[PDB]
Structure 1
Amino acid sequence: MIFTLRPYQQEAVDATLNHFRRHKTPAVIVLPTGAGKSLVIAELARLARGRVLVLAHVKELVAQNHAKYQALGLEADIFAAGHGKVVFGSVQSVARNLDAFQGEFSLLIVDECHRIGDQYQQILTHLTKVNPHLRLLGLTATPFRLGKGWIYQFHYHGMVRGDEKALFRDCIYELPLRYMIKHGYLTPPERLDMPVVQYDFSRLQAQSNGLFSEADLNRELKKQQRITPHIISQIMEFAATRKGVMIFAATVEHAKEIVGLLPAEDAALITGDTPGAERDVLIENFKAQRFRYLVNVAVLTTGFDAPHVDLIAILRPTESVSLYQQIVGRGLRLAPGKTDCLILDYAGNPHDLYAPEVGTPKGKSDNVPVQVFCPACGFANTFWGKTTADGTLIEHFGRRCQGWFEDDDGHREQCDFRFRFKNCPQCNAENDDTVLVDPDDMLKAALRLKDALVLRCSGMSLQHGHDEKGEWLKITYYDEDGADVSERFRLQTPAQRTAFEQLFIRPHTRTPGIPLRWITAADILAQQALLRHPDFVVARMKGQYWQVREKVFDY
């Protein structure tokens, strides 16, 4: 025709076609920010019946998307303040003019589809009303943002990222950032091997969601504000050998500090508090290099992502790779004679540009991604864990296999293998279909009763021995005030060592799914750092000595 697709662009067309030939449900394609997303929109539209509508929420992403589409030598329309086979509209402008969209429409593409949470469902109702079989494809460079969840639920590689509540049931294609860089479709990123002054944010604890707080951050900074223009110095140095420098501070009160730097008119701080009549006095100044330094709160973008950008200075710690790969990618575009984008990583971010995304909040700040094979389906999950020097698993915090599979009878389901269990994952209802009781409610019931003991567990000690019937292992749970409660396990018969693995190791192990190797009770004491202790123990006076009836783990 008029254009030629790259081998990865046909896969995204071919994947979107094979999906809509099978399923009527929406889908999403994950794409980098230098991928050439207009070429997929154009081929999909070349093969379409009726019309194709390319929505977007922010206006400049519409106008820019259209500029990128027509720049292919093709004809299309626009809907904003400003009838064709393809239309480029914005949610707000399209939602008041539904009278122009009454013909056949076979595809609706939603650019930056992660932003469907911030109207739009009025278009989805109208279109779906004229076109009952309208197909929905969304596009995005970030399908996951910490504190918001995921956009899709099922990934075509075989795992599960969200749940029934996700907007898009499926992600049918993903273009890795590693790939794009490997084959030159993207500028290569160089990290300054080591910087002499960075910050240290280990003395910080994320909130419940997983994101650090506006308060907690400017308090770790002030304690080191004596290290800041020693940093901007390094940043200042080679920021003369680059046409564009983007900086991401920890916040606004971190920008004002790091805004200067250079008394430029300007270095011109973008933030989430200006139009769009201001986004505009510096869009077109930065995209034209007026104005070289650009600092951000930030999220942020989704403009000012200009090809000429060739230096990324990380002035905030990244909680998830998705945000690090999101930042670093803002400046990986292709530009005439731009051999690389250098990344100056202050502030304690690892060199993990291709690390997998566990997609859950870390927890312990020293956690890292570890991979555990599912004993049922063999799917290799990525959980939060802690490894030693040689890459050996010490602990992992996954609870259920995240893989899924489908039968030739259409039925699709997630692997029901539980790494942490009562009789299913922590929840309200399985038989143990009775309403499950709550750990707090069970503690309260046993506190309110004598012949019962409820001790906060501070640790446990193991002892072993034997007699004419083989060995045994005695475990003793103790208080921070010396309160004891014990239980004993015989390890002699196969029905006895089997129960021991069933009743004591699977709940107490730190790497469930990975079995403990042992021959005698001695091999179990050797590895007692592989075992954790309950958080609460509940015991009933059944014999005149205390007997254990409940252990509470991960409270």
Structure 2
Amino acid sequence: IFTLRPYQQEAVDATLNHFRRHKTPAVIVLPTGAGKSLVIAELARLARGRVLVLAHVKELVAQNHAKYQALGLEADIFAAGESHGKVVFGSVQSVARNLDAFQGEFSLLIVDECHRIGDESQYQQILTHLTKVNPHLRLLGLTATPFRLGKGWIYQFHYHGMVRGDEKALFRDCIYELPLRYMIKHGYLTPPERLDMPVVQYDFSRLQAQSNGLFSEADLNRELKKQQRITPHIISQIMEFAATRKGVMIFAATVEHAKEIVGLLPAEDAALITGDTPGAERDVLIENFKAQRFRYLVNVAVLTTGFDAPHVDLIAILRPTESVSLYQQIVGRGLRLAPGKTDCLILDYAGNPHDLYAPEVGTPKKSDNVPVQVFCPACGFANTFWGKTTADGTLIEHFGRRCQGWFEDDDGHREQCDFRFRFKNCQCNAENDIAARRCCDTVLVDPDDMLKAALRLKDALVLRCSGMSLQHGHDEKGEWLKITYYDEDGADVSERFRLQTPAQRTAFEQLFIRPHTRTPGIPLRWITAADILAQQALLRHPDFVVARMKGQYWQVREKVFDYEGRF
């Protein structure tokens, strides 16, 4: 009935194949402005009952209903003001109060912007009702933001073979991803154009990332009072560029910062959407934007927009983007196609990096860590961890702990690879409480309790390691290496490894290189102790060392790497 672009047809066939094999929810990740209409339309033409396309934000419900009807097709909509024509568009709130109009056959429920499912209960009543009437209802998610630092991933298994979320994830599966790179290369989105060399810039290279990878509004604002002589320099330039631009989106750091940005722009050539703005004015600014009444839209929570207006051609980033995902999401808000649009201008006034095409690690950043690719010695899967690569381009250090690949067997059994880059014992994860299977389902002993126990023996030494030093020598049975661990206040303890026999070399790889290496999975290459001595920028020292007394000298019995306590 309709002609689909190839990526749309792949989205459809992905969905159909999945639900032909599986009952479980699945999500699809197409970028913003991908043309969902045809995906929904063809799935609906194939659907047996009716199809419910749900969304939490009214403006999106209306835009989806509109783009679908412009196909020459008919749909009902439920928001705040016809004929069941086999697709129904609805808001979460409007649907949870009209269930008796949704009691016929529904085969599929598409949730647009499904990352919003997390942020509550009206939606779950909706889903309890549809699953009550339709036990085999199939649920499909659409999102441009499957990940947010602080919230993790919307799904667990990616169909390319990488695990993202855990068992707690909402969608078990992501069954198709449309990459921004492909949309841009094939003119499916507006090509972006970022100005390499700007006027003055912010310097947020001084703030502390929190636990969840995000900075804080208080930490953002303190720093934004010491650079707030620089702020009108930006807006001025922003204003300059907006002479030959139609719509301009400013991404501010905090609520207070946003009001500043607004108070430096032409009075009501600019508007301000904050997380706490009435939805009588937020929607009036919605409609005044879209229309080109004002020129500047100042926002603060991003991922709070349907104001992706097609006419928008200037994105102003005045805030450091913690995840590359946040960066692509913000830029993408101005990449929709529009008549006359040749490019979208990207002005970033923080110290953000460039690649729209960057692999999203999925866990928080040291500030200076870049993605690194690491192959799994077990399954071969190309992994994306945080690391430091050298000027040339090879690995100084990487920070991953487990292979993220997964695989499916004959009998439908799906397993994540067990290879561990950082292990703990005879080899559950660095933060395992109980062994899966050895010292044996035993309770593992928390490094902190161990530390305190060793401090409660005055026959044991406990060094808070701050460095180590290597030395080698030989005698009638071969070479040997001697490592010496020291306190930042004097104390020594040392161990020594013969390197002569093959069993010696093997023990030394097991017990020294594999715990001490900075690039686990990539083998250190050595023939004698001099090669080890030459490479100790690839080796790390333990955070703690526990020695005991043999007879008359201290003997190492424990090292604690990758520490995470208060001791």
Equivalent position to 1:309, from 282, 307, 312:
312
For normalisation by structure 1, the TM-score amounts to 0.97
> After alignment, is 111-120 or 224-233 more displaced?
224-233
> After alignment, is 94-103 or 176-185 more displaced?
94-103
Over residues 325-360 of structure 1, what are the superposed CA-to-partner deviations in whole Å (9 max), with x where a residue is unaligned?
Answer: 000001100000100001011111111110000000
Over residues 127-151 of structure 1, what are the superposed CA-to-partner deviations in whole Å (9 max), with x where a residue is unaligned?
Answer: 1122111101011111001100100
Q: What is the CA–CA distance in structure 2 between the aligned matches of 1:428 and 1:240, rounded to whole Å?
A: 56
For the structure 1 residues 78 and 515, does the alpha-carbon distance in structure 2 shift closer, same or farther, using more than 3 Å as the test? same
Q: What is the CA–CA distance in structure 1 between the aligned matches of 2:331 and 2:277, rounded to whole Å?
A: 24
Q: What's the CA shift for 1:259?
A: 1.1
Q: What's the CA shift for 1:453?
A: 1.0
Q: What is the CA–CA distance in structure 2 between the aligned matches of 1:249 and 1:530, rounded to whole Å?
A: 40
| Maintained 8 Å contact 2:423/2:429 | no
Aligned to 1:242: 245
| Maintained 8 Å contact 2:268/2:294 | yes
Over residues 161-195 of structure 1, what are the superposed CA-to-partner deviations in whole Å (9 max), with x where a residue is unaligned?
Answer: 01010000000000000000000000000011211
| Maintained 8 Å contact 1:427/1:436 | no
Q: What is the CA–CA distance in structure 2 between the aligned matches of 1:264 and 1:283, rounded to whole Å?
A: 17
Q: What's the CA shift for 1:302?
A: 2.5
Q: Which runs of 5+ in 2 are unaligned?
A: 434-440
Over residues 14-48 of structure 1, what are the superposed CA-to-partner deviations in whole Å (9 max), with x where a residue is unaligned?
Answer: 00011011111110000111100111011000000
Over residues 503-541 of structure 1, what are the superposed CA-to-partner deviations in whole Å (9 max), with x where a residue is unaligned?
Answer: 001100000001111100000111111100000111111
Q: What's the CA shift for 1:427?
A: 6.5
> After alignment, is 60-69 or 492-501 more displaced?
60-69
| Maintained 8 Å contact 1:402/1:414 | yes
Q: What is the CA–CA distance in structure 1 between the aligned matches of 2:385 and 2:508, rounded to whole Å?
A: 26
Q: What is the CA–CA distance in structure 2 between the aligned matches of 1:369 and 1:164, rounded to whole Å?
A: 25
Q: What is the CA–CA distance in structure 2 between the aligned matches of 1:430 and 1:164, rounded to whole Å?
A: 17
Aligned to 1:408: 410
| Maintained 8 Å contact 2:246/2:312 | yes
Q: What is the CA–CA distance in structure 2 between the aligned matches of 1:204 and 1:39, rounded to whole Å?
A: 45
SS at match of 2:293: coil
SS at match of 1:273: coil
Over residues 67-126 of structure 1, what are the superposed CA-to-partner deviations in whole Å (9 max), with x where a residue is unaligned?
Answer: 111111111111222133111112112112221211111111111111111221222222
Over residues 359-392 of structure 1, what are the superposed CA-to-partner deviations in whole Å (9 max), with x where a residue is unaligned?
Answer: 0001x00111011000111111000001111111
SS at match of 2:129: helix
Q: State whether structure 2 residue 23 is matched by structure 1 residue 24.
A: yes
> After alignment, is 277-286 or 527-536 more displaced?
277-286
Aligned to 1:139: 142
Over residues 191-228 of structure 1, what are the superposed CA-to-partner deviations in whole Å (9 max), with x where a residue is unaligned?
Answer: 11211311111111111111010011112222221222
SS at match of 2:110: strand
Q: What's the CA shift for 1:428?
A: 8.7
Aligned to 1:209: 212
| Maintained 8 Å contact 1:198/1:347 | yes
SS at match of 1:122: helix
SS at match of 1:240: helix
Q: What is the CA–CA distance in structure 1 between the aligned matches of 2:457 and 2:480, rounded to whole Å?
A: 31
SS at match of 1:330: helix
SS at match of 2:131: helix
Q: What is the CA–CA distance in structure 2 between the aligned matches of 1:543 and 1:27, rounded to whole Å?
A: 63
Q: What's the CA shift for 1:286?
A: 1.4
| Maintained 8 Å contact 2:422/2:430 | no
Identity, % of aligned positions: 100
Q: Which runs of 5+ in 1 are unaligned?
A: none
Q: What's the CA shift for 1:420?
A: 0.1
| Maintained 8 Å contact 2:401/2:429 | no
Q: What is the CA–CA distance in structure 2 between the aligned matches of 1:165 and 1:284, rounded to whole Å?
A: 38
Q: What's the CA shift for 1:265?
A: 2.0
For the structure 1 residues 477 and 470, does the alpha-carbon distance in structure 2 shift closer, same or farther, using more than 3 Å as the test? same
Q: Which runs of 4+ in 1 moved over 6 A?
A: 426-432
Q: What is the CA–CA distance in structure 1 between the aligned matches of 2:6 and 2:267, rounded to whole Å?
A: 44
> After alignment, is 312-321 or 290-299 more displaced?
290-299
Q: What's the CA shift for 1:430?
A: 11
| Maintained 8 Å contact 1:264/1:291 | no
Aligned to 1:266: 269
SS at match of 2:127: helix
Q: What's the CA shift for 1:13?
A: 0.1
